[PDB]
Design a protein around this motif. Structure first.
Motif, mmCIF file in Angstrom:
data_model
loop_
_atom_site.group_PDB
_atom_site.id
_atom_site.type_symbol
_atom_site.label_atom_id
_atom_site.label_comp_id
_atom_site.label_asym_id
_atom_site.label_seq_id
_atom_site.Cartn_x
_atom_site.Cartn_y
_atom_site.Cartn_z
ATOM 1 N N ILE C 9 0.813 -1.210 0.000
ATOM 2 C CA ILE C 9 0.000 0.000 0.000
ATOM 3 C C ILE C 9 0.851 1.267 0.000
ATOM 4 O O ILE C 9 0.948 1.945 -1.029
ATOM 5 C CB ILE C 9 -0.970 -0.044 1.198
ATOM 6 C CG1 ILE C 9 -0.240 -0.529 2.458
ATOM 7 C CG2 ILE C 9 -2.149 -0.948 0.893
ATOM 8 C CD1 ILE C 9 -1.060 -0.478 3.723
ATOM 9 N N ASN C 10 1.476 1.611 1.128
ATOM 10 C CA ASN C 10 2.679 2.433 1.100
ATOM 11 C C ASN C 10 3.595 2.110 2.274
ATOM 12 O O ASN C 10 4.820 2.229 2.177
ATOM 13 C CB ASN C 10 2.311 3.918 1.112
ATOM 14 C CG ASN C 10 3.392 4.790 0.507
ATOM 15 O OD1 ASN C 10 4.441 4.298 0.089
ATOM 16 N ND2 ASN C 10 3.143 6.092 0.458
ATOM 17 N N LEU C 13 2.001 6.083 4.128
ATOM 18 C CA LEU C 13 0.764 6.768 4.461
ATOM 19 C C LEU C 13 0.239 6.337 5.821
ATOM 20 O O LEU C 13 -0.664 6.987 6.359
ATOM 21 C CB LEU C 13 -0.289 6.522 3.380
ATOM 22 C CG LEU C 13 -0.049 7.254 2.060
ATOM 23 C CD1 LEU C 13 -0.905 6.672 0.948
ATOM 24 C CD2 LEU C 13 -0.318 8.741 2.222
ATOM 25 N N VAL C 14 0.782 5.258 6.387
ATOM 26 C CA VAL C 14 0.376 4.824 7.716
ATOM 27 C C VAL C 14 1.414 5.242 8.751
ATOM 28 O O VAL C 14 1.161 6.144 9.559
ATOM 29 C CB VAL C 14 0.164 3.300 7.736
ATOM 30 C CG1 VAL C 14 -0.090 2.813 9.144
ATOM 31 C CG2 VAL C 14 -0.982 2.912 6.816
ATOM 32 N N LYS C 35 16.545 -21.011 9.437
ATOM 33 C CA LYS C 35 17.733 -21.375 8.669
ATOM 34 C C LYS C 35 18.918 -21.662 9.583
ATOM 35 O O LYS C 35 19.687 -22.599 9.339
ATOM 36 C CB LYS C 35 18.079 -20.267 7.674
ATOM 37 C CG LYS C 35 16.994 -19.996 6.648
ATOM 38 C CD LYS C 35 17.585 -19.750 5.271
ATOM 39 C CE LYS C 35 18.360 -18.445 5.227
ATOM 40 N NZ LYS C 35 19.030 -18.247 3.912
ATOM 41 N N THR C 165 -9.092 1.327 5.755
ATOM 42 C CA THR C 165 -7.672 1.345 6.094
ATOM 43 C C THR C 165 -7.282 0.108 6.895
ATOM 44 O O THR C 165 -6.267 -0.542 6.608
ATOM 45 C CB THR C 165 -7.346 2.617 6.876
ATOM 46 O OG1 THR C 165 -7.635 3.766 6.069
ATOM 47 C CG2 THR C 165 -5.890 2.638 7.296
ATOM 48 N N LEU C 168 -7.292 -2.946 4.637
ATOM 49 C CA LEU C 168 -6.137 -2.975 3.746
ATOM 50 C C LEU C 168 -4.874 -3.388 4.490
ATOM 51 O O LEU C 168 -4.070 -4.177 3.974
ATOM 52 C CB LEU C 168 -5.951 -1.608 3.087
ATOM 53 C CG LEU C 168 -6.872 -1.309 1.904
ATOM 54 C CD1 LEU C 168 -7.055 0.189 1.734
ATOM 55 C CD2 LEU C 168 -6.327 -1.933 0.632
ATOM 56 N N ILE C 169 -4.680 -2.873 5.706
ATOM 57 C CA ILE C 169 -3.491 -3.246 6.468
ATOM 58 C C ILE C 169 -3.551 -4.717 6.871
ATOM 59 O O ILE C 169 -2.530 -5.417 6.870
ATOM 60 C CB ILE C 169 -3.318 -2.326 7.688
ATOM 61 C CG1 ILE C 169 -3.189 -0.871 7.241
ATOM 62 C CG2 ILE C 169 -2.084 -2.720 8.470
ATOM 63 C CD1 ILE C 169 -3.433 0.126 8.347
ATOM 64 N N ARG C 186 9.470 -23.695 1.244
ATOM 65 C CA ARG C 186 10.533 -23.892 0.261
ATOM 66 C C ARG C 186 11.835 -24.314 0.928
ATOM 67 O O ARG C 186 12.525 -25.223 0.446
ATOM 68 C CB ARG C 186 10.739 -22.612 -0.548
ATOM 69 C CG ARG C 186 11.179 -22.845 -1.981
ATOM 70 C CD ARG C 186 11.428 -21.525 -2.696
ATOM 71 N NE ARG C 186 12.261 -20.622 -1.906
ATOM 72 C CZ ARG C 186 13.577 -20.746 -1.761
ATOM 73 N NH1 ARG C 186 14.225 -21.738 -2.355
ATOM 74 N NH2 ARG C 186 14.247 -19.873 -1.022
#
Ligand SMILES: Nc1nc2c(ncn2[C@@H]2O[C@H](COP(=O)(O)OP(=O)(O)NP(=O)(O)O)[C@@H](O)[C@H]2O)c(=O)[nH]1
Ligand SMILES: [Mg+2]
Ligand SMILES: [Mg+2]
Ligand SMILES: [Mg+2]
Lengths: 700, 176, 196, 50
Positions: C9-10, C13-14, C35, C165, C168-169, C186
């Motif tokens: 998202i960015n 902006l948060v 690992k 918001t 989205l987070i 993997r």
């Protein structure tokens, strides 16, 4: 039919071995010879069939000969011992043992083959052993066969002057007969089995075929010229009596001259034939009985030194379950007897001969008496070595006979038992196989001590695995050899750590300031070495010092990049602030954690093992060999242009020689050798280090 | 059969590499070649290098043709130096007079190249001057009384300094 | 079908109610820990540093064998453990080693604990694959805890911040967790191929 | 800018050639929405410079 055969004298006894390329017809030729001698009753094939010769299940399933088969049979007034050799590049030890035990070789070639570099290498082995050989050009019925082309190839790229003794009638599926040169006769074969039970002798069609007559007389003139140019006494006889005749005599003095040039290591008699179509085997046997040496025809220095003793050479061993330790040997001097104590020269010990017999490779006959110059099988010799001398009464700085040298196996694998409980069975089987085949070395790896097998090739390793599975019953697994990397740091790094554990009583506190730096005396201390520098603090470090050493050693045993051991670093203890009542174990734990963090944040570098690669190749194959070495990261140190050879000395990593023998043989068509020995550990450049890390992590 | 060139010593004609294997591959014996070379150059100072041409004929017969030594060796011997300079032009190894250049040209005029190319000694002198320029040896007109030794001392100290710097660089690379 | 549209998202902006850089650092720390465990413990063969992490019950607590003992090599295929400092916990050390999945059968000699190197065999490789799967599962549990902490922070901030918001987070954090668990799988597959 | 720099530096001879820029470094900001794709809500967030 003719199983009961009578022993003969020296002049009527021969011992020979058959050598050729892979799939050249040795087993088929031996089967045809036995069928004609009468011991074999039914005619079979290697595909379906596989009679007395190649009796093993692996040899039946793979269509190849693994171990040499020793057989005894009788010709017309001649008792002969034959040895069918494997003829693969991975059984050169067996080939060399069968060449060294006794003289006399039959080199079989394929008409539409060429050189067949395995034939070239067995020819070199026979030349080193200094044994006479006779060339048999088999596979005359195969399409594309060319007797003249095969003879030309033998003359050119084998470097030995041949003596043609037979002319085929046809080449491509029309080879129905042969024409002899010394006897001036034609031999025909018109049947399916045994081809008429005999060969039809109608000498040159009774003066009726002018072309055949002219070719035969020209071949006779060429053969006479060759033998006269080679031998001097025969040249004198031709000079004195039969010069203008050009037709000296049928079969006495010409055959004497050919026998002399056979025994003089300056000529090989070449006879054509075809075993699968049952053609030429009887003429081959006749020439074997007329030309190939008897045991005493070669003046053995051993026999000249001693003949009244019981000198004999044990050259092969076998570990059959019911029979026990079987020993294949050759009797050199005197007449051997069963149930008599015998002495070893290598092992200076006495052994009891449980029983003695003659080998037919599928059954026991228990032959009571055997004389000198015979291959024999002895039972009950538990303490036996691959190369040793066995005598009686200890007549004689020591009567030791130069036996078989280990061929320095080059291919490496790791064997995996299915379980720890089954591991003793695997170890016993491996010990038995090691005592059977001395070219199969088994070693313990220094780091990550798996059990490794050192053999002559991938096929040799695969058949050893199959034999272990079949004869002893183990489901083992093969794997590539493991590479022992090392680790080092590139820049000096500090580290701090604190340890507290309030369990109740015995409160403790540890605070460690340390730093790790690269060391400079790597060449001075090539072994894994560490520098341990404590600063001026605390005034007294004995138990704390011992805890320091233990903890830092434990930390260094494991690396932060590949889990590989770390080496060539300097650890300096700047502060070791301990609380009264701390335990040395907890101090060591704190220091180990601090050192682990320091090495983690230290810009670590990985080091590979480096060794010396010494490759001997030809000139037409040097460029692909050098290209492959450069592909596998071999830094060429020197190149020497040897006599008809090229020796490259370089440095190649362990991780890049996985299965190098197979690739080298593929590139050089089998005519190449190489030697290895570990020298040092080098540091990878960042490109190779990143490539290795990416490979170990997968694709990212 | 072919053309073979070889840089061989006056008397150190060993039957080994990198000359023995080539002649063996060609087919002629190497012992005969070494014996012929030694007997032909027995009057030449052993140790100096010289180019030679070997002609091999069918039936494995060989003949030897020997020319004058290398101009590199001639000029290094004239200047009294054992090895040439690395940075040509920027540094100078020795000084060779035009008189020494003319002597070298006169002694080397009787080689195959300048014999087949009948040219005056001016061309040979110019070639020697160019070879000296490549060698890094300056060619002063007429200056050798004691300044030759004066330059020799400073050249020796410069060579010692260069050796020390090379050792330091090698040590730094090894420790890096 | 693409079926999963990646969102970045960015994080900027948060910048205040959640730290996507911090969450990514924590997930990378989880991967690095997995690992490091794979490298230190399950190489091909047990080493004194490999069994230095086996927890042993002591004073109603968990302590390591390296902490409560001195582990060294006596023979090339033997490990010697000296519990001189804590002779009481000898039986607990035996229990830890024996029910440890690393296939180490120790012999009790009063205080000098003797651990032979069993072998490198097919059975040993299978047990090592089992241990690798167990460690991958433990790392996945740790990653789940790390993701749950970020979700709890979003829940704390879920009183004044927009629902879109927060959604989205949450989607971004779920995507990061999915990427990291895929990386864990993997790594486990690569290690299994290496062992077998 | 990086493409031009790398290409010219690797393919140009420093001993006989020299190069100079004639455009300034990226200074003009370009904004992308990011949080929320619906139209409106204000200006976007600065993504890169041109
Ligand atoms: N056409 C044709 N095939 C032949 C002839 N002799 C042998 N063969 C074929 O060649 C193959 C190999 O036969 P074999 O006798 O086992 O040869 P070998 O030299 O013993 N093989 P190895 O070296 O592995 O032991 C078989 O398929 C056989 O049929 C021949 O005269 N003509
Ligand atoms: Mg074939
Ligand atoms: Mg086959
Ligand atoms: Mg065979």
């Amino acid at each position: 039919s003719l199983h009961s055969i009578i022993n003969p004298p020296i002049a009527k006894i021969r011992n020979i071995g058959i050598m050729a390329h892979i799939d050249a017809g040795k087993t088929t030729t031996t089967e045809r010879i036995l069928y004609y001698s009468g011991y074999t009753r039914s005619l079979g094939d290697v595909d379906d069939g596989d009679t007395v010769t190649d009796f093993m299940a692996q040899e039946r399933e793979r269509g190849i000969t693994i171990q040499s088969a020793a057989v005894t049979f009788d010709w017309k007034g001649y008792r002969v011992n034959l040895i069918d050799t494997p003829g693969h590049v991975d059984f050169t030890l067996e080939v060399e043992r069968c060449l060294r035990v006794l003289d006399g070789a039959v080199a079989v070639f394929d008409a539409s083959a060429g050189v067949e570099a395995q034939t070239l290498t067995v020819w070199r082995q026979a030349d080193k052993h200094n044994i006479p050989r006779i060339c048999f050009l088999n596979k005359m019925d195969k399409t594309g066969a060319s007797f003249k082309y095969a003879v030309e190839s033998i003359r050119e790229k084998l470097k030995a002057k041949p003596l043609l003794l037979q002319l085929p009638i046809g080449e491509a599926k029309t080879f129905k007969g042969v024409v002899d040169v010394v006897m001036k006769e034609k031999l025909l074969w018109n049947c399916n089995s045994n081809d008429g039970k005999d060969f039809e002798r109608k000498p040159l069609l009774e003066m009726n075929d002018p072309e055949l007559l002219k070719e035969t007389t020209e071949a006779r003139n060429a053969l006479i010229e060759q033998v006269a140019d080679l031998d001097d006494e025969f040249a004198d006889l031709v000079l004195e009596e039969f010069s203008e005749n050009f037709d000296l005599l049928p079969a006495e003095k010409l055959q004497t001259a050919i026998h002399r040039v056979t025994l003089a290591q300056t000529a090989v008699p070449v006879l054509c034939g075809s075993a699968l179509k049952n053609k030429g085997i009887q003429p081959l046997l006749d020439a074997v009985t007329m030309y190939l040496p008897s045991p005493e025809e070669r003046n053995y220095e051993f026999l000249q030194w001693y003949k009244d003793d019981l000198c004999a050479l044990a050259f092969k061993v076998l570990h059959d379950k019911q029979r026990g330790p079987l020993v294949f040997m050759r009797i050199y001097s005197g007449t051997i007897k069963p149930q008599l104590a015998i002495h070893n020269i290598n092992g200076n010990c006495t052994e009891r001969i449980s029983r003695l017999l003659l080998p037919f490779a599928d059954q026991h006959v228990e032959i009571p008496s055997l004389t000198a110059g015979n291959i024999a099988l002895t039972v009950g010799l538990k303490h036996t070595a691959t190369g040793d001398t066995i005598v009686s009464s200890k007549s004689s700085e020591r009567l030791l006979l130069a036996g078989v040298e280990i061929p320095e196996p080059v291919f490496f694998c790791t064997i995996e038992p299915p379980s720890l409980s089954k591991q003793p069975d695997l170890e016993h089987a491996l010990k038995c196989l090691q005592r059977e085949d001395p070219s199969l070395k088994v070693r313990l790896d220094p780091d990550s001590g798996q059990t490794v097998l050192c053999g002559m090739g991938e096929l040799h390793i695969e058949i050893i695995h199959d034999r272990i599975k079949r004869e002893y019953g183990l489901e083992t697994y093969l794997g590539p050899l493991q590479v022992a990397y090392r680790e080092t740091i590139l820049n000096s790094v500090r580290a701090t750590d604190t340890l507290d554990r309030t369990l109740g009583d015995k409160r403790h506190l540890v605070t460690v300031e340390v730093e790790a730096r690269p060391i400079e005396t790597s060449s001075v201390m090539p072994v894994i070495e560490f520098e341990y520098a404590e600063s001026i603090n605390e005034g007294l470090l004995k138990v704390s010092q011992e805890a320091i050493e233990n903890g830092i050693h434990s930390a260094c045993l494991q690396g932060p990049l590949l889990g590989s051991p770390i080496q060539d670093v300097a650890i300096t203890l700047h502060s070791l602030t301990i609380h009264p009542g701390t335990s040395t174990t907890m101090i060591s734990a704190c220091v180990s954690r601090c050192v682990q963090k320091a090495l983690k944040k230290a810009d670590k570098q990985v080091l590979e093992p480096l060794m010396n690669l010494e490759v001997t190749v030809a000139r037409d194959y040097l460029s692909p060999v050098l290209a492959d070495l450069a592909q596998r990261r071999g830094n060429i140190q020197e190149i020497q242009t040897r006599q008809d050879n090229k020796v490259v000395i370089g440095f190649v990593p362990l991780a890049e020689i996985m299965g190098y023998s197979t690739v080298l043989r593929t590139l050089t068509s089998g005519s190449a050798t190489f030697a290895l020995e570990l020298s040092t550990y080098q540091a990878m450049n960042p490109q190779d280090q990143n490539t290795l890390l990416n490979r170990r992590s997968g694709l990212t | 059969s072919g053309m073979i060139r070889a840089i061989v010593r006056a008397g150190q004609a060993r039957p080994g590499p990198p000359l023995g294997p080539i002649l063996g591959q060609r087919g002629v014996s190497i012992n005969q070649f070494c014996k012929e070379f030694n007997e032909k150059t027995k009057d030449i100072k052993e140790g100096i290098p010289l180019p030679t041409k070997i002609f091999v004929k069918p039936d494995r017969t060989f003949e030897i043709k020997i020319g004058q030594p290398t101009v590199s060796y001639f000029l290094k011997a004239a200047a009294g130096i054992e090895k040439g300079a690395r940075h040509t032009g920027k540094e100078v190894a020795g000084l060779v007079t035009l008189k020494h250049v003319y002597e070298i040209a006169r002694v080397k005029a009787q080689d195959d190249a300048f014999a087949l190319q009948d040219v005056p000694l001016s061309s040979v002198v110019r070639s020697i001057i160019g070879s000296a320029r490549s060698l890094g040896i300056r060619v002063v007109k007429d200056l050798s009384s004691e300044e030759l030794a004066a330059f020799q001392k400073e050249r020796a100290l410069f060579l010692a300094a260069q050796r020390e710097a090379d050792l330091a660089a090698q040590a730094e690379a090894a420790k890096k | 079908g693409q079926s999963q549209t990646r969102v970045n998202i960015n994080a900027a902006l948060v910048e205040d109610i959640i730290n996507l850089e911090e969450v990514n650092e924590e997930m990378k720390s989880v991967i690095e820990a997995l690992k490091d465990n794979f490298n230190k413990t399950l190489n091909i063969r047990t080493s004194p540093g490999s069994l230095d992490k086996i927890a042993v019950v002591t004073a109603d607590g968990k302590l390591a064998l390296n902490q409560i003992s001195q582990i060294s090599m006596k023979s090339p295929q033997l490990i010697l453990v000296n519990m001189a400092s804590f002779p009481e916990c000898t039986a607990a050390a035996i229990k830890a080693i024996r029910e440890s999945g690393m296939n180490l059968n120790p012999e009790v000699e009063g205080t000098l604990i003797r651990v032979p190197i069993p072998q490198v065999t097919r059975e040993h490789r299978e047990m090592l694959v089992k241990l690798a799967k167990q460690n991958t599962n433990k790392a996945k549990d740790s990653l789940r805890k790390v993701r749950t902490n970020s979700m709890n922070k979003l829940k704390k901030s879920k009183d004044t911040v927009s629902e879109d918001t927060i959604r989205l987070i949450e989607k971004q954090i779920s995507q990061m967790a999915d990427d990291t668990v895929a990386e864990l799988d993997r790594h486990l597959a690569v290690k299994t191929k290496e062992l077998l | 800018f990086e493409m031009m720099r790398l290409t010219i530096n690797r393919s140009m001879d420093p001993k006989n050639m020299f190069a100079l820029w004639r455009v300034p470094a990226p200074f003009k900001p370009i904004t992308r929405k990011g949080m929320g794709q619906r139209m409106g809500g204000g200006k976007g967030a600065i993504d890169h410079y041109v």
